[PDB]
């Protein structure tokens, strides 16, 4: 499904990303916008055979199992199909892990190119929360 920006902001804040690893809520909302255009079914194939899944484009090499990624680690311990759900619980809980490796949100390349350093607080203005 395609999330609306404020509804995604509310579910992300409820699931604990506001200020997770010091990154304000607007960062995660902006990330979803540029990684998948807020579409929970988005998929993106990589040259290393991995695929990026869901609203936060979680990579199949290190985070979830898709059975077709060659040297996969399934740190999140889940099938990638579970990252394609309308329910973002599993993607947010895996995204938390992704952000805690010592490098912040830098693995989300579209975040890095489109959101980082920008006025990401704008992505949540006009939202209940």
């Amino acid at each position: 499904k395609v999330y609306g920006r404020c509804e995604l902001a509310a579910a992300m804040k409820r699931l604990g990303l506001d200020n997770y690893r010091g990154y304000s809520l607007g960062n995660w909302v902006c990330a979803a916008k540029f990684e998948s255009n807020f579409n929970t079914h988005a998929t993106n194939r990589n040259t290393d055979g991995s695929t990026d899944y869901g609203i936060l484009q979680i990579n199949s090499r290190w985070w979830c199992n898709d059975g077709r990624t060659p040297g996969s680690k399934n740190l999140c311990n889940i099938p990638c199909s579970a990252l394609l759900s309308s329910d973002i619980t599993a993607s947010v809980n895996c995204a938390k892990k992704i952000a805690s490796g010592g490098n912040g949100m830098n693995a989300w390349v579209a975040w890095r190119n489109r959101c980082k350093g920008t006025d990401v607080h704008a992505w949540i203005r006009g939202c209940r929360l």
Partner: single-chain antibody, 222 residues
């Protein structure tokens, strides 16, 4: 060819200042956090701080704030470490590093010679093992959150290598023989048949809450 070239062994008098550098190649530092680590002559690892070079924001272990300052210059791809009022306790090897799931890389280190809070407990401090024995080292904390713990292996004279990520996942290229376990506060590293390449010092690092902290280490001897 991914790398961090550390610039300069130095000898200084008590009270002097030194500024070290760490230039990277293969990746832009603006795209990362750059961490600095201290290691005294027969002692353990200590996290000093990190810098986010894209915006210059830094985070320190409060004990180093005022003595060590991290700085970064993105056009030169270089991160720096400035140390002030140097004393006997500052004689150490200082590494820069990029920590990222399955992408850890460290500089070769740089020796500085001065010449005139989560607790990680590592057991055993030192041990003698045999040629095909089963070894289990442990690491106990004060609630590491779920498994934000790295296992590093350091050989005499080399930068530490990462063996385990997220407590139980093997690094790329690490032999089958190694394995990690636990969640919560209690973690372990097991080597089934100790191979001869395994003689070294093992350290656990918690990156679950900031200031990142290291266990005291375990020297395995064959």
């Amino acid at each position: 060819q991914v790398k961090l070239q550390q610039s300069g062994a130095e000898l200084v008098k008590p009270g002097a200042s030194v500024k070290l550098s760490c230039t990277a190649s293969g990746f832009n530092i603006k795209d990362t956090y750059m961490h600095w680590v201290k290691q005294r002559p027969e002692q353990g690892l200590e996290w000093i701080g990190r810098i986010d070079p894209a915006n210059g924001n830094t985070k320190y272990d409060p004990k180093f704030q005022g003595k060590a300052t991290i700085t970064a210059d993105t056009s030169s791809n270089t991160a720096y470490l400035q140390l002030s009022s140097l004393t006997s306790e500052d004689t150490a090897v200082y590494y820069c590093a990029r920590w990222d799931w399955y992408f850890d890389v460290w500089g070769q280190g740089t020796t500085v010679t001065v010449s005139s809070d989560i607790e990680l407990t590592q057991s055993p401090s030192s041990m003698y093992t045999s040629l095909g024995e089963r070894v289990t080292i442990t690491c106990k904390a004060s609630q590491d959150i779920n498994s934000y713990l790295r296992w590093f292996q350091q050989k005499p004279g080399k930068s530490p290598k990462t063996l385990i990520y997220y407590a139980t996942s093997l690094a790329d290229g690490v032999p089958s023989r190694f394995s990690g376990s636990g969640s919560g506060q209690d973690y372990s590293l097991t080597i089934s048949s100790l191979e001869s390449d395994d003689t070294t010092t093992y350290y656990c690092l918690q990156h679950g809450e900031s200031p990142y902290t290291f266990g005291g280490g375990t020297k395995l001897e064959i």
